[PDB]
Structures are given as C-alpha cells and as structure tokens.
C-alpha cells in the first residue's frame, strides 16, 4: 500500500514542476538586461563594538535603528547603542551556548536561545530597574536556531527538532506547531505584514508558513544543500535564502519557483546570513570566507565586499531605515558599515 | 544642550559599569577550560559523567583539578544530526570522544564511532580542536577476547596482518591478545587522526574503564599537553 501512495506523490511533484515551468515564461535575468547597473558599492567599518569574549553567532537590529542586540556563546547578550557605541545592557545568559537573539518591535522585550532547548525572554525596562527573565519557553527537542517577535506577546521560534512553533509569552504555551520541515530548521524571516513567515531548513528546502492557519502554504527546493539563512524581500512578495551551496537564490511566493541565483567561481564556502536593503535592490550575504559580499538583487553581480572581519561571519542585519548594515563574526567583534 | 549632555553622561556611566562587569567576567572566563563530551549512546559516557561528578539540551558538570576550573558539557536530548550544532564547540579546549572498544561486534558500533571521529577530525571548524579519545569499556573487551567470543578477525580483516607495536606498554598480567586488540583499536583511530598531518590539533588516546578514577587526571593532563603544544607551535617549537 505504501508504494501506491508514492506514485501519487511523484505525479504531484511532476505536476508542480510542469506548472512552474509553464509559469516561467521569461527569466528575471533576461528582462533585467536593459536596466541601469548599480555599479561599484563601497562600504568600510564605521563602528567597532568590543566586549564579547567568545564568538558571536546572532544579532538583530531594533525598530529604532539605533539599538543593537548581539548574542555571543560566552553567555552574554549585550545591547549596544550603535550611534554612541555604549553598551546599554549586558545580560548574563543561563546557558552559554546561545544560538539566536531577537529584539521586540516595541523594544520592551528581548529573546534568545540555543542548545539549552529554552527560548528565554528578557524584560529590559522592568519597574525594578534590573533585567530579568520574564518567562522561559520550553518544549523543543532540538536546538533553537532562530526566533523573531510578532508582538510583545507572540514570538515565532525555530528549533533543531525540525519543527517551528508559535509561542504565547503570557501563557508560555505553543499557539501552533509547524512540522512540515524534515531537516534542521536554521533561520526564520517574518513578512512585513506578519501574516506569513518563511523558514529555511537543512533539507535544502524553504517553506512559506501561515501564522494563523498553522501550515506551509508553499514549498521551495531550489537549493541543493542545507539552508542557513532566509530573509524576506522588503515588499514581502519574495525572499532570499543562504545555504552551504555558497550561492544565494531568490524565490517569489506568487511564482512558487526560483527567480535568480547569485554565485561566483571563487566562492566555495557556505553562507551564514542574508539580508536586503530598504529598497531591496542590494542583497547582502555573509560568507564563511571571513568577508561579506554585496550582491545586486537584479543584475546578479557583486557590488561590494565587506572584508573587515578576521573570522567567520555568522550574522548580518540591516536597520529598518536602511542607514547602515551591522555584521557579526566569530572574531567577537561587530562591524557597522555605511 | 544640557539634557543631551546629561543623557550622554548617564550612558557613559552605564557603559563604565558594564565594562567593569565584563572585565570581571572575562577574568573568570579565561580561567575556565571548556570541554565537549561526545560518544555513542551505549558507551560509558554516562558512567564517566557520574564518576566525575562524584531534559535540557546541554548538561554541564563542574569539576576542578589543581585549582583549575573545567566546564564539561554533555550534549543530551539532541537529534543525531550533529553537523550543525557541533560547530558551536569550535573554541573548546578539547573534545572528549568516548568509544566502547568492546562494541566491535555488538551492528558494529565501533565502525560508526570511527566514522564519527573521522567526521569530527576533518570538520573545517574543528581543525584547531584537540580530541581526547577515551577507549572505554576495556574490561568488557578483555573479557570478550579472553572468553573467545571476540570475532574482530573478520570484522576488521586488517587485524590478522596487524601486530602489537614495540612501543606498547601493556599493564602487568595483561594477556597478549588483549594488548593486541587494544592497540589495534587505538591504531584504528590514530590512522584517522594522523592522516591530517597538520599539527594544529592532536589526538590523545587512553585506555580507560567506565568506573576508572583516573579519568579526571587524564583529562587534566591532556588539557595541559594541548596547551603546551599550542604554545610550542606558536613559538615555532613544534
């Protein structure tokens, strides 16, 4: 009886492939031939943040575009004032093996997690004046890879148990569970409207998840290796992913297929983080080769290189206003570029 | 602007407090040597953890040797996919890999352990991480070899051609067959580790039992040797 279902599954996959091929009337590169190239893009270090003892693995920009939260595997979740470089807070994490951090849109709460199976929520402005764990989210059976706040009460978290979950901070329960992924989920990206989010996994596939319906609306399998990063296009109709492929790929939700691929011969190492500028024209991705390559989202060419890191670049983030891009690396330093 | 200057002064005071706290934290952190404990589920890793101590994803044990603090992390409640979360332990002083040497025939878990050791050794991010190889369950291996239940001759056909190294130092009263099997198992891992030939990291095999009381001393000696070798290589002495 098992084999009978597999013929159905293969026929469905072939039908999806045929539909995607039919919808591929023209490629993005061909239509993009007659647009003005972006040209040379140059950026150098503007602010150097120091104080982390171990390798930095995750970071996130605040909504104000001035506060920065960085997570290091030494057990410190430091909050930095980018404009003045001052360290607003230095939160000592219960578990030193933190693999993710998130800044709430209102800035009232900060989340983090890692190998401890627990996504800790920290309140920054408690009336007592100190920073303390508002509540710890537990229930995962893997390693927390990424997390992002939908609101001050709802947070989406990704874990190494191959499932993503939506948590209610007030009650600490899982509002919904996402189990469509087969491999380890590595990154999350919330849409501008927060209605849908895309999660990359080690199964070399990206899935578009509906927050309320608790299901994947679409699945993408453009990449051939583990997907480490994912980021929505600013309009929310497309997203880009980073993987061990050493290449970046762009997907559109409406087209339900890959649009563009960013690759180059001299690049053979994996990709850790990816982000989009405010306009979405520039695609910035972090690489294991200790430098970040700026890719034109349309021309499929490298516009600039950020080689101001002495170790693996593990995270990347662009301010909401797009003024500057901050990159973290294993060298325990954060570089802000403009 | 007076309000702005007051705000900057408050931010600078907070920065100074945070820097003092981070300096103290750096001082305490540098004094600690982090270790990663790995091994098969059927291995004596749990027994070793219990001896050293005497569903969270990471279990940490505190133990001190010669007034030197060590943090050993046991990766539990984690899926068998290790290629991702293993990268978090690139900066650990050493990786204590526990292998059930007697599991050469009980599916042969020894081959799986060898493959895992090879993957750890050849990882790009673990090139600078030394591995402390604990060949656990030596008593069971010796009992099985003496009792005749051992069939490693066909499981590992290289055993027939293999011979006991002259450098071997068998314990008193140890049967020649037991020594031969032990050193063959050790050389199986030495082949993988010696293959790199880079000198950035080294393997430290040890014949240990589940309830061995010298495991802490072995770990301390391995860490000291690793640090000494790193310093010597830095000064072109190795």
């Amino acid at each position, epitope marked *: 009886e098992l084999d009978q279902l597999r013929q159905e599954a293969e026929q469905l996959k072939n039908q999806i492939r045929d539909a995607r091929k039919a919808c591929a009337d023209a490629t993005l590169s061909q239509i993009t031939n007659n647009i003005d190239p972006v040209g040379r893009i140059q950026m150098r270090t503007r602010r150097t943040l120091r104080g982390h003892l171990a390798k930095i693995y995750a970071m996130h920009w605040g909504t104000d575009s001035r506060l920065l939260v960085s997570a290091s595997q030494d057990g410190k979740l430091i909050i930095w004032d980018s404009y003045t470089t001052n360290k607003v807070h230095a939160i000592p994490l219960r578990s030193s093996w933190v693999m993710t951090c998130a800044y709430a849109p209102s800035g009232n709460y900060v989340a983090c997690g890692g190998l401890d199976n627990i996504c800790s929520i920290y309140n920054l402005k408690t009336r007592e004046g100190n920073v303390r764990v508002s509540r710890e989210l537990a229930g995962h059976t893997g390693y927390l890879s990424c997390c992002r706040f939908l609101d001050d009460n709802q947070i989406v978290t990704s874990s190494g148990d*191959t499932t993503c979950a939506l948590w209610d901070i007030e009650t600490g329960q899982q509002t919904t569970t996402f189990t469509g992924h*087969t491999g380890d989920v590595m990154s999350l990206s919330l849409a501008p409207d927060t209605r849908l989010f895309v999660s990359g996994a080690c199964d070399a596939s990206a899935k578009l998840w509906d927050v309320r319906e608790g299901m994947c609306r679409q699945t993408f399998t453009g990449h*051939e290796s583990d997907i480490n990063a994912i980021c929505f296009f600013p309009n929310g109709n497309a997203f880009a992913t980073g993987s061990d492929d050493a290449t970046c790929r762009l997907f559109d939700l409406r087209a339900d297929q890959e649009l563009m691929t960013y690759s180059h011969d001299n690049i053979i190492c994996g990709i850790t983080s990816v982000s989009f500028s405010k306009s979405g024209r520039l695609l910035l991705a972090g690489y294991d080769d200790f430098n970040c390559n700026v890719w034109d989202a349309l021309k499929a060419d490298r516009a600039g290189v950020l080689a101001g890191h002495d170790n693996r670049v593990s995270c990347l983030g662009v301010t909401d206003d797009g003024m500057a891009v901050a990159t973290g690396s294993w060298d325990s330093f954060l570089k802000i570029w403009n | 602007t007076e309000d702005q200057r007051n705000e900057e002064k408050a931010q600078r005071e907070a920065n100074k407090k945070i820097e003092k706290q981070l300096q103290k934290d750096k001082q305490v952190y540098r004094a600690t040597h982090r270790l990663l404990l790995l091994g098969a589920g059927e291995s004596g890793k749990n027994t070793i953890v219990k001896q050293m101590r005497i569903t969270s994803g990471i279990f940490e044990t505190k133990f001190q040797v010669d007034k030197v603090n060590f943090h050993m992390f046991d990766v539990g409640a984690q899926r068998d*996919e290790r290629r991702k979360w293993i990268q978090c332990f690139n900066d650990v002083t050493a990786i204590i890999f526990v292998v059930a040497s007697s599991s050469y025939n009980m*599916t042969n878990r020894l*081959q799986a352990a060898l*493959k895992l050791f090879d993957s750890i050794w050849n*990882n*790009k991010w673990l090139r600078d991480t030394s591995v402390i190889l604990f060949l656990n369950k030596q008593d069971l291996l010796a009992e099985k070899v003496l009792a005749g239940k051992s069939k490693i001759e066909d499981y590992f*056909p290289e055993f027939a051609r293999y011979t006991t190294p002259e450098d071997a130092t068998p314990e008193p009263g140890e049967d020649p067959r037991v020594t031969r099997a032990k050193y063959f198992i050790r050389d199986e891992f030495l082949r993988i580790s010696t293959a790199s030939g880079d000198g950035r990291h080294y393997c430290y095999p040890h014949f240990t039992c589940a309830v061995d009381t010298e495991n802490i001393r072995r770990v301390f000696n391995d860490c000291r040797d690793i640090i000494q070798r790193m310093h010597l290589r830095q000064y072109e002495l190795l």
Partner: nanobody
Amino acid sequence: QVQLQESGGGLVQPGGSLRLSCAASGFTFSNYKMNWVRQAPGKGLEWVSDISQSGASISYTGSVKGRFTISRDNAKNTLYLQMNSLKPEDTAVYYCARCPAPFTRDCFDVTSTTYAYRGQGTQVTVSS
C-alpha cells in the same frame, strides 16, 4: 530538488553477485562525496562504503572491503556499487547517501535516522 533513486535488487542466492545503480539529479554530483549505507531488518543504519569527489580515494567497512566495489561517473551523474559474493547477512536496504555539503571532507549525518540527502534504496534479499 535533491533527488536520489536506486535500481536493482530482488532475491539472490548466497554467493551471487549484484550491482546497484544510484541515479542522482538536482545537484552537482562531482562536488559531493557519495556514500552507501544499509539497514538490515530490525537493525540500525550501517555505513558500507564511500567515494571521494574525484573517486581517487576509496574506503570500505571491515566486513565489505574487497568483496564489494564502489564506482562513480561524474559525466552521467550516477553512482554504482558492485555487490559481489553476497553473504546471507548482507540482506538490507542499501541507501545511496550524499554528504551534507560540497567540498567538505566531513560527512557526519549519512547514517542519521532522518537524514534528508539520502537515497531511498532497494530491498536486497540473500537466501536460497
């Protein structure tokens, strides 16, 4: 889409010979080390053999070296495993496994319970 498929199998008397074919598509075959793993009835997944990207380096498990032979063809995007002198205990589903990442010597999770880059395999039975 990373897809791996196998061909060949069926009932074979002990001491016979069989050849497995692994059809790979959706990824650059030449940039990934390939592996063969098997899962006997009621037992866990056991690694069998591996082939380097260029095929120059070859290794087999202790109970398989010499008896079997692994070969790859980067031009046709196919991998082969010449199963010669099958033993009765060799009966198992042989999976054509790909390493998680290209250019990396480490191949950690080929034997994992729920690996994603594995070939699903064909049942092999060795009996009279």
